[PDB]
Amino acid sequence: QCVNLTTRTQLPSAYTNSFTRGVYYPDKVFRSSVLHSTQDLFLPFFSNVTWFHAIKRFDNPVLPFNDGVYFASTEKSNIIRGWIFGTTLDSKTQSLLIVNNATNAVIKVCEFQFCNDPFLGVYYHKNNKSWMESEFRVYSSANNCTFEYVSQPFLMDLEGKQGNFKNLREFVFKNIDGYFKIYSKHTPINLVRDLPQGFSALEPLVDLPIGINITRFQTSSSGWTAGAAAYYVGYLQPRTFLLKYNENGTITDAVDCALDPLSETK
Amino acid sequence: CTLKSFTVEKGIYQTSNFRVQPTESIVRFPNITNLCPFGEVFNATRFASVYAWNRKRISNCVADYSVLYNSASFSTFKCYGVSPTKLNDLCFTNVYADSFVIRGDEVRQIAPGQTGKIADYNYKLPDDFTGCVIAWNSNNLDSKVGGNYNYLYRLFRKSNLKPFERDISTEIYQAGNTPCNGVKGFNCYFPLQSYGFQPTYGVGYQPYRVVVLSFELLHAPATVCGPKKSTNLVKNKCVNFNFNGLTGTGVLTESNKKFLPFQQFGRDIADTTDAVRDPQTLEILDITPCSFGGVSVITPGTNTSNQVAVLYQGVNCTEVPVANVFQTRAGCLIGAEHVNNSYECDIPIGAGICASYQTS
Amino acid sequence: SVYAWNRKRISNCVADYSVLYNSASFSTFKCYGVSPTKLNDLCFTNVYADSFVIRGDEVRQIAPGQTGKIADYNYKLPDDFTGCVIAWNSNNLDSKVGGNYNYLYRLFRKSNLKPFERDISTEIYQAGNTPCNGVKGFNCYFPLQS
Amino acid sequence: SRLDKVEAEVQIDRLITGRLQSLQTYVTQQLIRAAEIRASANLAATKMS
Amino acid sequence: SRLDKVEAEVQIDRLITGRLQSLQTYVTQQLIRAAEIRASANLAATKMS
Amino acid sequence: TMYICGDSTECSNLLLQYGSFCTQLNRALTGIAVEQDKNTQEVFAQVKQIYKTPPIKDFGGFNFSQILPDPSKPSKRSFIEDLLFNKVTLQKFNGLTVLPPLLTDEMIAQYTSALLAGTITS
Numbered sequence: 001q002c003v004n005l006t007t008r009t010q011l012p013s014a015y016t017n018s019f020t021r022g023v024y025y026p027d028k029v030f031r032s033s034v035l036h037s038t039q040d041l042f043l044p045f046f047s048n049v050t051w052f053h054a055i056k057r058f059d060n061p062v063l064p065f066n067d068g069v070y071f072a073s074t075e076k077s078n079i080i081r082g083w084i085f086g087t088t089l090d091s092k093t094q095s096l097l098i099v100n101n102a103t104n105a106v107i108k109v110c111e112f113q114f115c116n117d118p119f120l121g122v123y124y125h126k127n128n129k130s131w132m133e134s135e136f137r138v139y140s141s142a143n144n145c146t147f148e149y150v151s152q153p154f155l156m157d158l159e160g161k162q163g164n165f166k167n168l169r170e171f172v173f174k175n176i177d178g179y180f181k182i183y184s185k186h187t188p189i190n191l192v193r194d195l196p197q198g199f200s201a202l203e204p205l206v207d208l209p210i211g212i213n214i215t216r217f218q219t220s221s222s223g224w225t226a227g228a229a230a231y232y233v234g235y236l237q238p239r240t241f242l243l244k245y246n247e248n249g250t251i252t253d254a255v256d257c258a259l260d261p262l263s264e265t266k
Numbered sequence: 267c268t269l270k271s272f273t274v275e276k277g278i279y280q281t282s283n284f285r286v287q288p289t290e291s292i293v294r295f296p297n298i299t300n301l302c303p304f305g306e307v308f309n310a311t312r313f314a315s316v317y318a319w320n321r322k323r324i325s326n327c328v329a330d331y332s333v334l335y336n337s338a339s340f341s342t343f344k345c346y347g348v349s350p351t352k353l354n355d356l357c358f359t360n361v362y363a364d365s366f367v368i369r370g371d372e373v374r375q376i377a378p379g380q381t382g383k384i385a386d387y388n389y390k391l392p393d394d395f396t397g398c399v400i401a402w403n404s405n406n407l408d409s410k411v412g413g414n415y416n417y418l419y420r421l422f423r424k425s426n427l428k429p430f431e432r433d434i435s436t437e438i439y440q441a442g443n444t445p446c447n448g449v450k451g452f453n454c455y456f457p458l459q460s461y462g463f464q465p466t467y468g469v470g471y472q473p474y475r476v477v478v479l480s481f482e483l484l485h486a487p488a489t490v491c492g493p494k495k496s497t498n499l500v501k502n503k504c505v506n507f508n509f510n511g512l513t514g515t516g517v518l519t520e521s522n523k524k525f526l527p528f529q530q531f532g533r534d535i536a537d538t539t540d541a542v543r544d545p546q547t548l549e550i551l552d553i554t555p556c557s558f559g560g561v562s563v564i565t566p567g568t569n570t571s572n573q574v575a576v577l578y579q580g581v582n583c584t585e586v587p588v589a590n591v592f593q594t595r596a597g598c599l600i601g602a603e604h605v606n607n608s609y610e611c612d613i614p615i616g617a618g619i620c621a622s623y624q625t626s
Numbered sequence: 627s628v629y630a631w632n633r634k635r636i637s638n639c640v641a642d643y644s645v646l647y648n649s650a651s652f653s654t655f656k657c658y659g660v661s662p663t664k665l666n667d668l669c670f671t672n673v674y675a676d677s678f679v680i681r682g683d684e685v686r687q688i689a690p691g692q693t694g695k696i697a698d699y700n701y702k703l704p705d706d707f708t709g710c711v712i713a714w715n716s717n718n719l720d721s722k723v724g725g726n727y728n729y730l731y732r733l734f735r736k737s738n739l740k741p742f743e744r745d746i747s748t749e750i751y752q753a754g755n756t757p758c759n760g761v762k763g764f765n766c767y768f769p770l771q772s
Numbered sequence: 773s774r775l776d777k778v779e780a781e782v783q784i785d786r787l788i789t790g791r792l793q794s795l796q797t798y799v800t801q802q803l804i805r806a807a808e809i810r811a812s813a814n815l816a817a818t819k820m821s
Numbered sequence: 822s823r824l825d826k827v828e829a830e831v832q833i834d835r836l837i838t839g840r841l842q843s844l845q846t847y848v849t850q851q852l853i854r855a856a857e858i859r860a861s862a863n864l865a866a867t868k869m870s
Numbered sequence: 871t872m873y874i875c876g877d878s879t880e881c882s883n884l885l886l887q888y889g890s891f892c893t894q895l896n897r898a899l900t901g902i903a904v905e906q907d908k909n910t911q912e913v914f915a916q917v918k919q920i921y922k923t924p925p926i927k928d929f930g931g932f933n934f935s936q937i938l939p940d941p942s943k944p945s946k947r948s949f950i951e952d953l954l955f956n957k958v959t960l961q962k963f964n965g966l967t968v969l970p971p972l973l974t975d976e977m978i979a980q981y982t983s984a985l986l987a988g989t990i991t992s
C-alpha cells in the first residue's frame with residue numbers, strides 16, 4: 001500500500017567534499033599503538049561526495065549498490081528511518097529492509113513488493129505536538145520470508161527538533177559473502193550545513209548472515225512538510241588506508257594511500 | 267648417536283631439542299540459549315490432517331535433537347539423509363517441519379520410493395529424500411468412542427501430484443467418462459472421507475501422529491541447528507585452548523590489557539594472537555606458550571672420562587623435570603658443581619660462565 | 627561376505643597374468659601400483675588372494691583412501707595399497723529369485739578400524755545412549771545387515 | 773580439520789614446499805651479512821692493534 | 822621398470838625438483854665459503870710480500 | 871621442525887621425506903653463532919694483563935675524566951659511553967630464540983679500561 005509523492009522538484013546532484021569522514025573498524029581485533037594497513041571498501045578522503053538538499057525537497061530515488069555504500073546524515077530529530085538493499089525490488093527476489101521507528105529497529109527479509117515511493121506516515125502537524133508512526137507505506141506483501149530481527153525496546157524522540165544539526169549520524173553498509181553489515185556512530189557538532197573537519201571513528205552495530213544478492217538500493221495523501229535535512233551518499237571502492245591505533249584501541253588518524261604522492265610515500 | 271661416532275671430543279654439543287608437552291585440552295565458547303518451542307508443536311492441542319497438512323516456519327533457534335530422540339513416547343524414527351545422531355553438528359539453513367496423523371497401516375507409505383494411497387495422492391516424496399520421519403501412537407488421545415470424524419483424507423484424486431505439493435481442491439470427483447454436476451449423482455464421489463479412530467482398533471488402525479524434519483541445503487546462511495558446549499577455565503599450565511576456533515597451546519594468565527566492549531582478540535606487530543577475551547565471562551588474558559629450548563650436552567673427551575652435564579638453552583629449570591642446579595641468564599645448568607675461584611675459560615657456556623674438568 | 631572375506635596364500639610359483647590381462651570376462655581391470663602390461667616381468671614376495679562379493683554399484687569405495695560404509699566398516703584398502711583390483715558382473719552366479727540374503731555387511735560398529743581387519747562378531751550395537759542388554763530392544767541393531 | 777586425508781596431504785604439500793622456500797631465503801641473507809661483518813671486525817682489529 | 826610412459830612422467834618430475842633443489846643449495850654454499858678463502862689468500866700475500 | 875610444522879604430528883611426518891634439510895639449516899645458523907664470539911674476542915682482548923689506573927690524576931694539566939671509568943655508576947662506565955648506550959634503539963613463539971653473548975656488556979667495559987690505562991702511562 002503506497003501513495004506516490006509526485007509533487008517533487010528534480011534537484012541536481014550538488015557536490016561537496018567529505019573531508020575525513022567514513023573511517024570505521026574493519027575487523028573485531030584490538031591492537032595498541034601500531035599502524036595497521038588494510039585493503040577493504042572505504043570512503044575516500046576529500047572525495048567529491050553528493051550532498052542532498054531536503055526540506056518541498058524530498059526526492060526518493062533508486063541508486064545502484066556496488067562494492068558497498070556510504071551514508072552520512074547531518075540531522076535533527078532523526079527524519080532518517082532506514083534503507084533497503086536488493087537486486088530486483090519487485091517481490092521477485094528477496095530484498096533487505098531496515099526500518100527504525102519509535103519502538104524498535106526491525107529487520108525484515110522477504111521478497112518485498114517494493115513500491116516506487118517508500119515512506120512512513122506520521123501524525124501530520126495540525127495543532128497537536130505529537131509524532132509517531134502511522135503508515136507502513138513501504139511495501140505491500142511479504143510472502144516468503146526467511147530472516148527477521150528486532151532489537152530490545154526503546155523510545156526515540158520524534159519531536160521536530162529545529163536549529164542547526166546537533167547530532168551526527170554516519171552509517172556504512174557492506175555485503176561480503178552473504179553477510180550483511182551495518183555500522184553506526186553518534187557525536188555532536190555545531191556547523192551550518194556542511195560537513196565538519198575532524199577525525200572520528202564509526203563503531204560496528206550488528207552482523208547479519210542474510211545471503212541475498214544486492215545490486216541496487218533505495219532510501220491527505222499528497223503534500224507534506226519535512227524538516228531541513230542534509231544527508232549524503234558516497235560510494236566505496238577497494239582502497240588502502242593506514243590506520244593509526246592508539247594504545248587504547250581507538251583510531252586517531254588515517255591516511256589514504258591513493259590520494260597523492262605524499263600519501264603514497266607515507 | 268648424533269655425532270655418528272663412538273668417540274666425542276672435548277666441547278659443548280647441541281642435540282635433541284626440548285619442548286614442554288601440554289597437559290590437556292580446554293574448550294571455551296559463548297552462551298547458547300535461544301530455543302524455539304518444539305514443545306508447543308509436539309504437545310500441540312490438535313494436529314492438521316493429511317489432506318491439508320500444514321507447513322510452519324522454523325527460524326533462528328536451536329534444534330536440540332537429544333531431547334527429541336531420547337523420548338520413548340515415539341513409535342518410529344527414521345532419518346533418510348544423514349545418521350540420526352549427527353544432526354546436532356551439521357547446521358541447517360532451514361528446516362521444514364510438518365505434523366500429520368495417518369493410519370498405522372499407511373505408515374509404510376511415508377517412506378520414500380513406496381506405493382500407497384497417501385504416498386500417491388497427497389504426500390509424495392522425491393527419489394532423493396533427506397529428511398527424518400518420526401511417528402508416535404496417539405490412540406488414547408485422538409480416538410473418540412463415537413468416532414473422531416475431524417480428520418479427512420483424499421479418497422479420490424484426479425492425478426498423482428508432485429512431492430510436497432499441498433492442495434485444497436474438494437470438488438466432487440468424476441470416476442466415469444460422464445461429467446459430474448451437483449453434490450450427488452452417478453460417478454459423483456466425495457474426494458474426502460473421514461478417519462474413524464476407536465480404542466478397539468489394534469496396531470495398524472490406530473491414529474499415529476507423524477512429524478518429519480526435512481531441510482534444504484546451502485542456499486542461504488545457516489539459521490537453525492543443534493546445541494554446543496564448553497568447559498571450566500584453568501590457568502597457570504599450558505593447555506590446548508579452543509576459543510571460537512582459536513586453537514592454540516599456551517599458559518593462561520590474567521592480564522592488564524583493557525578491550526573495547528565489542529573487541530575480541532589481540533595482535534602485535536608480529537601479526538599473531540596475543541590476548542583473548544572469554545566469550546562467557548568478560549576478562550582479558552595473556553597467551554605465552556610454555557617453555558621450549560635446545561638441550562646441550564657438556565662433556566670432556568671420551569678417553570678422559572664419561573661424566574657429563576646437560577644445559578637447557580634459555581629454559582627455566584623450575585620446570586625442568588618434565589624431560590645440583592644453578593641458574594644462569596643463558597639457561598639452568600645441572601650436574602655441575604659450582605665454585606668461586608676464577609680461571610681461564612675452558613669451554614664456553616654463555617653469559618660469562620665457563621665449565622671445566624677439574625678436581626677426583 | 628565383506629565381513630568374512632577369504633584370504634589364500636600363494637607363493638613359490640610362476641604367475642601367468644597374460645591370460646588375466648587378455649581375458650574378456652573382466653568388466654573391471656584397474657590396477658593402482660602396477661600397470662598390467664609390464665606385470666609379467668615382475669617378481670613378487672607374496673600373493674594376497676583376497677576375495678568377496680559386493681553390489682555392482684559398490685565399487686567406488688574399493689579405491690584406496692575412500693570413505694563411506696564399506697571402507698569405514700568392513701573392507702579397507704590402505705592409503706599406499708599396491709596391487710590390482712578385479713571385478714566382473716556375476717548376477718547369474720550370485721543372484722537368486724528369492725533373494726541372496728546369505729551375505730551380510732557391517733552397517734554399525736564402534737569406530738574406524740585398521741586395514742585388512744576381519745570380524746564376524748554379532749554383538750548388538752548400542753546406537754542409542756541408553757544401555758542395551760540381551761539381544762533385542764529399541765535402537766538395539768545388530769551390526770550386520772542383509 | 774576440513775578435508776579428508778586422501779588429499780589433505782596435497783594441500784599441505786604446498787605449505788611444506790612453500791615454508792621451506794621462505795626459510796631458505798632468510799638463512800642465505802644471514803650468510804651474506806655475516807661475511808660482511810667480518811670485513812668490519814677484522815678492520816677494527818687492525819685499528820686497535 | 823614398474824610404470825609405463827604416462828605416469829612415469831609425473832613421478833620423475835618431482836624427483837628432479839627434489840634433486841635440483843639439493844644441487845642448488847650445495848652450489849650456493851660453496852660460493853660463500855669460496856669467497857672466504859679469497860680473503861684469506863689475499864692476506865697471506867700481503868704478509869709474504 | 872618447530873617453525874615448519876609446529877605442534878602437529880602429521881605435518882612433522884611429511885617433512886621427514888625431504889631428507890637432511892633440517893639438519894643443514896641448524897648447522898648453518900650455528901656456524902655464524904660461534905663466529906660472533908670470535909670477533910669480539912679478537913678486537914678487545916689484545917691485552918691479557920689487565921692494568922688499572924692509579925688513583926692520582928696529576929696528568930700534566932690534561933684530564934681524562936670523560937674517558938676514565940666513573941666508579942659512581944653501577945657499571946664501571948665513563949661519561950662518553952653512557953651517551954652511546956642511550957642513543958641506540960633495539961623467546962618468540964615460533965622457535966625464534968636469541969642467545970646471550972659470551973662476554974657480558976660489563977665485561978667489555980673492563981677491557982677498554984685496561985687498553986686505556988696502559989696507553990696513558992706506559
Ligand SMILES: *[C@@H]1O[C@H](CO)[C@@H](O[C@@H]2O[C@H](CO)[C@@H](O)[C@H](O)[C@H]2NC(C)=O)[C@H](O)[C@H]1NC(C)=O
Pocket residue numbers: 002003004116117
Ligand atoms: C506510483 O508510481 C509508479 C511509477 O513511478 C507506478 O508504477 C507504474 O505502474 C503502471 C501500472 O501500475 C505501469 O504501467 C508503469 O510502467 C509503472 N511505472 C514504472 C516506472 O515502472 C505505480 O503504479 C504508482 N502507484 C501508485 C499507487 O500511484
Ligand SMILES: *[C@@H]1O[C@H](CO)[C@@H](O[C@@H]2O[C@H](CO)[C@@H](O)[C@H](O)[C@H]2NC(C)=O)[C@H](O)[C@H]1NC(C)=O
Pocket residue numbers: 101102103104106132133148150
Ligand atoms: C516499529 O516496528 C516494529 C516492527 O514491526 C513493531 O513491532 C511490532 O509491534 C506489534 C504490536 O506492538 C506486534 O504485534 C508485532 O509482533 C511487532 N513486530 C515484531 C516483528 O515483533 C512496532 O510496533 C513498531 N512501532 C511503532 C511505534 O509503530
Ligand SMILES: *[C@@H]1O[C@H](CO)[C@@H](O[C@@H]2O[C@H](CO)[C@@H](O)[C@H](O)[C@H]2NC(C)=O)[C@H](O)[C@H]1NC(C)=O
Pocket residue numbers: 143144
Ligand atoms: C518462496 O515462496 C514463493 C511462493 O510461496 C515461491 O514462489 C513459487 O515458486 C514456485 C516454483 O519455484 C512456483 O511454482 C510458484 O508459482 C511460486 N509462487 C508464486 C506465488 O509465484 C518461491 O519459489 C519461494 N522461494 C524459494 C527460494 O523457493
Ligand SMILES: *[C@@H]1O[C@H](CO)[C@@H](O[C@@H]2O[C@H](CO)[C@@H](O)[C@H](O)[C@H]2NC(C)=O)[C@H](O)[C@H]1NC(C)=O
Pocket residue numbers: 246247248
Ligand atoms: C586510554 O584510556 C584511559 C582510560 O580511559 C585513559 O586514562 C584516562 O585519562 C583521562 C585524561 O588523561 C583521565 O581523566 C581518566 O581518569 C583516565 N582514566 C583511567 C582509567 O586511567 C588514557 O589517557 C587513554 N590513553 C591516552 C593516551 O590518552
Ligand SMILES: *[C@@H]1O[C@H](CO)[C@@H](O[C@@H]2O[C@H](CO)[C@@H](O)[C@H](O)[C@H]2NC(C)=O)[C@H](O)[C@H]1NC(C)=O
Pocket residue numbers: 582583584593594595
Ligand atoms: C624461573 O621461574 C621462577 C618461578 O616461575 C622465577 O622465580 C620467580 O621470580 C619472580 C621475580 O622476582 C618472583 O616474583 C617469584 O616469586 C618467583 N617465583 C618462584 C617460585 O621463585 C624465576 O625468576 C625464573 N627464572 C628465570 C631466569 O626466568
Ligand SMILES: *[C@@H]1O[C@H](CO)[C@@H](O[C@@H]2O[C@H](CO)[C@@H](O)[C@H](O)[C@H]2NC(C)=O)[C@H](O)[C@H]1NC(C)=O
Pocket residue numbers: 932933935
Ligand atoms: C678536569 O677537567 C674537566 C673538564 O675540563 C673538569 O670537569 C668539570 O669541573 C667542574 C669544576 O668542579 C665541575 O663543576 C664540572 O661538573 C666538571 N665537568 C663534569 C662533566 O662533571 C674537571 O673539574 C677537571 N678536574 C680537575 C681536577 O681540574
Ligand SMILES: *[C@@H]1O[C@H](CO)[C@@H](O)[C@H](O)[C@H]1NC(C)=O
Pocket residue numbers: 015047048
Ligand atoms: C567534484 O565536483 C567538481 C566541480 O563540480 C569537479 O571539478 C570534480 O571533478 C568532482 N570530483 C571528481 C572526483 O570528479
Ligand SMILES: *[C@@H]1O[C@H](CO)[C@@H](O)[C@H](O)[C@H]1NC(C)=O
Pocket residue numbers: 126127128
Ligand atoms: C489532537 O488530538 C485530539 C485527540 O487525539 C483530537 O480530538 C484533536 O482534534 C487533535 N487536534 C486537532 C487540531 O485536530
Ligand SMILES: *[C@@H]1O[C@H](CO)[C@@H](O)[C@H](O)[C@H]1NC(C)=O
Pocket residue numbers: 087211212213214485
Ligand atoms: C543473485 O543474482 C546473481 C546474478 O547473476 C546470481 O549470480 C546469484 O546466484 C544470485 N544469488 C542467489 C543466492 O541466487
Ligand SMILES: *[C@@H]1O[C@H](CO)[C@@H](O)[C@H](O)[C@H]1NC(C)=O
Pocket residue numbers: 569570
Ligand atoms: C685419549 O686418551 C688415551 C689414553 O687412554 C690416549 O692414548 C689418546 O692419545 C688420547 N686421545 C688424544 C686425542 O690425545
Ligand SMILES: *[C@@H]1O[C@H](CO)[C@@H](O)[C@H](O)[C@H]1NC(C)=O
Pocket residue numbers: 605606
Ligand atoms: C661463593 O661466594 C658466595 C658469595 O655470594 C657465597 O655465598 C658462597 O658460599 C661462596 N662459595 C663457597 C663454596 O663458599
